[PDB]
Amino acid sequence: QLREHVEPVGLEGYRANKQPPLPPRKYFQEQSRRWRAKVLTERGVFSADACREHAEAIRPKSYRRRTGIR
C-alpha cells in the first residue's frame, strides 16, 4: 500500500515503466475466433487471411499476468 501511494515510484515517463500488455480478454478472443471461422468458411484454408492468421498465431507473444478478477 505504501508502494502504491506514499513512496515516489511511478514518476518517470510512459516509455520507461511501460509493461507488456495483458492477454486478450475473453470477449476479444471470441470475436477473433468468430472472424477466423468466417474466414475459413467463405475464403478457404489456403487464403492469405487464413495463412497470415496461422502465422501470427504460431509466433510467441510477450504478455503479463492478470492480477484481478476481470
Q: Which residues bind RNA (CB under 7 A)?
A: 19-20, 23, 34, 37-38, 41-44, 46-49, 51-52, 55-56, 59-66
Residues 48/5, Cβ–Cβ less than 8 Å: no
Min separation Cβ 2 and RNA, Å: 22
> By C-beta, is 10 or 60 nearer to RNA?
60
CB of 9 to RNA, least distance (A): 15
**What's the CA gap between 10 and 26, in Å, rounded?**
29
Quote the Cα angle for 16-22-26, to 5°. Answer: 160
